């Protein structure tokens, strides 16, 4: 319900705005040539340097639900995260790493999540030498066009799945949704063991048709 | 019995992380930027100094008879001109190209790219999903790693497999082998999460997620009946 702030303007943040249509987003960047393109994308543009602390206030990082940082280099990206933390220590920061070497320093400055496009892209290229099935899979489930969506579904308190093992729940046989993992806090287990027992607050990461997903949500709700 | 020849056109941070996963394989890197020479050699690859857009220097990188060719140049304009050059040489060799702008994906496929990776689109769509929690972003970046306990692997169904003509429901792959079937592919088509009655054919590739112990337990299950 709260404004997202986006620092810097790039092809990444352009595809980000396209998925945040309807939401309130501020874009703090120094390139005045991107104003009219930002506005056409349903966001607000703020002219300032994202590395300067005073210009971060104008984009109202305090009380943002999240901040996404993608600047020219990792040096300036770090400087921006350092600047953000000098204002809000708890606000969620998402940063894009250019080079793999710099991931550690970004996390250190205070990024809660680091995205590494050139590393993902390189590892999909190397796996696409014979066939493109993995690269197809990734680029499909992250799309809104796909028949199968990858979704995050929380297990609520009083859920009739509380304390049930993965084996007993039989989620795929019941709902038709494939459980590719369950996360909690900042830890995620891919392909959970058969004996893992569900807790409230666990987030189920799945793949399935919109119809399968609704059957899943009704399956993990409380009995009532 | 080993495919021995990948060609790489252009040098970027992408193609750099690509080389880290092709260690052991024979790789040629064609680029006009001379500064990356020693950086290429330390990755266990061979360097070719030339323009990837000039057809004669594409000959020198040994494009003909390559198992695949990867193109990542500065612009989408320059990437296309390189794909056209490659096609003027080998019309059947497999090409993987990196798109800068989303608008240009169609033109890249048109020129002859068999697979297009769009890094800025994948990352951009990952950022929008990482607003609340980073679980999609964690999953995508983890299954692609060598250190992770779970691997995403591609496993071909051999001729005479005991899965030939068996439905997904009857095969019971996860309950038996422990591997999660996230899809089955063939040619340039991939079905994500195949329906309960899909029947396996020889030549099908299973896209799966599992522990190495689970992966081998799977291969013995889909092996041929007559060895
Ligand atoms: Ca960027
Ligand atoms: Ca399903
Ligand atoms: Ca590039
Ligand atoms: Ca498993
Ligand atoms: Na705040």
Curated annotation (Swiss-Prot), chain A:
Q: How does it sit in the membrane?
A: Multi-pass membrane protein
| Binding site residues for Ca(2+) | 70, 96, 98
Keywords associated with the record: Calcium, Cell membrane, Ion channel, Ion transport, Membrane, Metal-binding, Potassium, Potassium transport, Transmembrane, Transmembrane helix, Transport
The residues covered by the RCK C-terminal domain are 138-222
Under the subunit heading, UniProt states: Homotetramer.
Specify the RCK N-terminal domain's residue ranges.
1-116
Keyword Transmembrane among UniProt keywords: yes
Domain of life here? Answer: Archaea
Gene name linked to the record: mthK
Identification of the protein by name: Calcium-gated potassium channel MthK
Q: Name one GO molecular function term.
A: identical protein binding
Miscellaneous notes for this chain?
It is not known whether calcium is the physiological ligand.
User: Where is this gene product found?
Assistant: Cell membrane
Included range, full protein: 115 to 336 of 336
Q: What does it do?
A: Calcium-gated potassium channel.
């Amino acid at each position: 319900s709260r404004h997202v702030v986006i620092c810097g303007w790039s092809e990444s943040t352009l595809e980000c705005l396209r998925e945040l249509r309807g939401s309130e987003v501020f874009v703090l960047a120094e390139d005045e040539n991107v104003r009219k393109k930002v506005l056409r994308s349903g966001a607000n543009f703020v002219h300032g340097d994202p590395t300067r602390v005073s210009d971060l206030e104008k984009a109202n990082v305090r009380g943002a639900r999240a901040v996404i940082v993608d600047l020219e280099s990792d040096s300036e990206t770090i400087h921006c995260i350092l600047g953000i933390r000098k204002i809000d220590e708890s606000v969620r920061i998402i940063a894009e790493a250019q080079r793999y070497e710099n991931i550690e320093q970004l996390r250190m400055a205070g990024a809660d999540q680091v995205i590494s496009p050139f590393v993902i892209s390189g590892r999909l290229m190397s796996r696409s030498i014979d066939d493109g099935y993995e690269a197809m899979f990734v680029q499909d489930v992250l799309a809104e066009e796909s028949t199968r969506r990858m979704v995050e579904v929380p297990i609520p308190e009083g859920s009739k799945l509380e304390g049930v093992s993965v084996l007993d729940a039989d989620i795929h046989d019941v709902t038709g949704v494939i459980i590719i993992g369950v996360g909690r806090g900042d830890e995620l287990i891919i392909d959970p063991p058969r004996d893992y027992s569900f807790r409230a607050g666990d987030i189920i990461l799945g793949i399935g048709k919109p119809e399968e997903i609704e059957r899943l949500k009704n399956y993990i709700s409380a009995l009532v």
